[model samples]
Target chain A: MKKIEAIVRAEKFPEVKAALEERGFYGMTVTDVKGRGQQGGMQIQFRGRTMEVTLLPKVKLEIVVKDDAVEEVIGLIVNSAFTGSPGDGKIFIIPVEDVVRIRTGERGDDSL
Target chain B: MKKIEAIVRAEKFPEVKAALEERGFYGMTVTDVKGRGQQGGMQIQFRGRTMEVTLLPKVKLEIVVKDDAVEEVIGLIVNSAFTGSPGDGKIFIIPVEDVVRIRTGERGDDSL
Candidate 1:
C-alpha cells in the first residue's frame, strides 16, 4: 500500500477533498500545518521593519490507498490543488508496511 | 527510515507525547482526525430516534525515525496509548524514500 501526503494551500483544501470524494475515497486525515517551500514565504512590515514570514499555514491531507491507485490519486490531488504558482506545495509518496483496525483486529487492506 | 503514524485516542495523546519526549524523539507532526473501526462509534439518543455516530474523534501523531528506532518508538506509543480495549487505535509503519527541509534545502536524513 501507499500513503499519500499532500501539503497544499489552505484555500484549495475544499476542492481537493471534493475531488477525492468524487473519486470514491472517503477515508482521510486532515491537518493544519506550517509549511515553507522554495518560495521561502513572504516579507511583511512588522513595526516598520521588514520581517520574513517563513512559515505559511497549509492543509495536509493524508490517505492510504492500494498501490495501484497512487497515480490516479496523485492526479486528482494535483489537478484540484494546483494554482500554478509558488507555494502550491508538494506530495510525498510513502510505502506502508501494514495497517490494523483496532476494534475489529483486522489487518492490512482489510483494515484500510 | 520509517514514518510511524499512530492513530490514538485523544485522551491518550499527552501520555504518548510524554513517552516519546522522554525517549528523545522531539520532532513530530500532530493532527486532529476522526476514525471508525469495527466498533463503529457509539449510539446517541436524539429527540425521537437513536443516531449512529460512526466517526470518533482521534489524534494522529506522526514522526519519522531511524530504522533502528522504530521498535523503540512503537513500544513507547503502545505502552503509553494502550487501554487494552476498543478505540485504542492503531499504528502504521511506512518507509520514507526522502525528506526535504524546505528552509535549508536539505534532503534525505539530513532534513529529517
Candidate 2:
C-alpha cells in the first residue's frame, strides 16, 4: 500500500474530501495545521498590532490506498485543491507496510 | 527514514503522547481534526437543530524515525491507542526521503 498526504488550503477542505469520497475512496484522515512553504510568510493585523504569520493555516489529508491507485488518487487531490498559486499545496507519496482496522483487527487492504 | 502517523480519539491523546515520550521518542507534531471511518456518521444537536456529523473529533500525530525503529514505534503506538472499539484509531507508516530541522538549518537524521 501507499500513503498519500496532501497539504492544502483549508478553504478547499470540505470539497476536496467530498471529491475523494465521490471517487470511491472513503477512508481518510484530516488535520488542521499551520505550515510554511516557499511562499515564506504572510502579514496580518490583529487589533492595532501587525504580525507576520510564517506558518499559514492548512488542512492535511492522509489517505492510504492500494499500490495501483496512488497516482489516480493524488491526481484527484491536486485537481480539487489547486488554486494556481504558490501555496496552493503539496502532496507527498510514501510507502506503507501494513494497515489495521481496530474493531475487527482486519489487516491490509481489508482495513482500507 | 520513515514517517509514522496516528489518528486517535481526542480523549486518549495525552496518554499517547506520554507513552511515546516514555519510549524515548520525542519531537513529534500534532493537530486537531475530524474524521469518518468504517462506523460511519454520528448524530448531534446544535442550537436546537439535529445534525448528522459524518465526521468525529480526533488528534493526529506525525513523527519521523530512523529506519530500524519503524516496527517497534508502530507497535508502541498501537498498544497505547487501542481501546477495543471501532474508532480507537489508526496508524500509518510511510517512507521519508529527507527531513529538516528549520531553526538551525540542520538536515536529515540530525534534524530528527
Candidate 3:
C-alpha cells in the first residue's frame, strides 16, 4: 500500500477533495498545518532589520491507497494542486504497512 | 519504523495524547482537521433550501514508532479512542525511510 501526503494552499482544499472523491477515493483525511518549505514563512521588516520566520496556513490532505492507485492519485493531486508557484505545495508518497477501520476491525487493504 | 496517523473526533484528543505519552511516546504531532468519512458530513437546511454538506471539527494525531511497538501503540489508541459508533475514526500505518532531528542533526531512527 502507499500513503499520499499532499500539502497545498488552504483555499485549494475543496477542489482537491472533489477531484479525489470523484475518482472513487473517499477515505481521506485533511489537516490544517503550518508549512515551512523552501519559500520559508512570512517575513516582516522593522527599522531596516527583519525577523526571518513565520508560518503559512496550509492544508495537509492524506490518503492511503492500494499500490495500484498511487500513480494516478499522485498525478491527479499534482494537477489539481498546481498553482505554478512555490507554495503550490508538494505530495509525498510513503509505503504503508496496514490500516484498520476501528468501527469494524477490518484489516489491511480491506480496511482502506 | 512506522508512522501511525489517527483521525479522531476532536473531543477524544486528550485521552489519546495521555495514553500515548504514558507509553513513552512523546515525539508526536497533533493537527486540527476536518474528517469526512463513510459518514459523510453535517447537513444544513436554510429557508427550505439545503446545503448538502459541511465539515466537522476533527483532530488528527500522528506518531512515529519503531516496528516492534506498532501493535502495542495501535492497541493503546484503539482502546483509548473507542466509543463504538460511526466517526470513531481510523488508524493508518506507513513505512518511513528516515527521520532527522534538525536541532542536533540526528538521523534515522535516532531522530525519531
The parts of candidate 3 lying over 4 Å away from their true place are A35-55, B37-53, B98-112
lDDT of 1 by residue, A1-112 (tens): 8889999998898778778776777566777789864442386343322444567689887888888889999999999899998788899998899775544556678766
In model 1, what is the error at residue A31, expressed in angstroms? 1.5
> Which digits, one per residue and each the tens of the lDDT, describe model 2 over residues A10-108?
888777876787777766777778886444237534222234436768998888899999989988888889889778888988788877665455778
Which portions of model 1 show Cα errors greater than 4 Å? A37-53, B14-57, B63-89, B96-112
**What's candidate 3's DockQ score?**
0.47
Tens-digit lDDT string for candidate 3 (A1-112): 8889999887677777767777877667777788754442376342222444456678888888999999999987888788887788889987778887877777887887
Docking quality tier of model 3: acceptable
lDDT, each prediction:
0.78, 0.77, 0.78
TM-scores of all predicted structures: 0.62, 0.68, 0.74
Cα misplacement distance, residue B22 of candidate 1 (Å)? 11
Q: Please give the TM-score for the first chain of candidate 3.
A: 0.82
DockQ of 1: 0.29
**Candidate 1 residue lDDT tens string, B76-107:** 88878887787787788888878888899987
| DockQ scores of the candidates | 0.29, 0.36, 0.47
Instruction: Point out the worst 10-residue segment of candidate 3 chain B by lDDT.
Output: B44-53
